């Protein structure tokens, strides 16, 4: 069972492994979950958006 995702909100490491914070489509924020990177293979476009955003912020900070 796979659910449509609306946005990737965050990244973290839990015991050395990466996870991302998922906002699900048609579900409010209270239903947001941290999922392992392994689980988001089918929403990489969104993941990519999130990575770009982070990069942009880093570059704002460094300049």
């Amino acid at each position: 069972e796979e659910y449509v995702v609306e946005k990737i909100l965050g990244k973290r490491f839990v015991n050395g492994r990466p996870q991302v914070l998922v906002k699900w489509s048609g579900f409010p924020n209270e239903n947001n979950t941290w999922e392992p990177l392994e689980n988001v293979g089918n929403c990489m476009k969104l993941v990519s958006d999130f990575e770009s955003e982070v990069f942009r912020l880093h570059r704002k900070a460094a300049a």
Binding site: E1, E2, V5, E6, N42, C43, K45
Partner: peptide, 8 residues
């Protein structure tokens, strides 16, 4: 281009 993912 359809954005999906497994839940926990």
């Amino acid at each position: 281009t359809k954005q999906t993912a497994r839940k926990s």
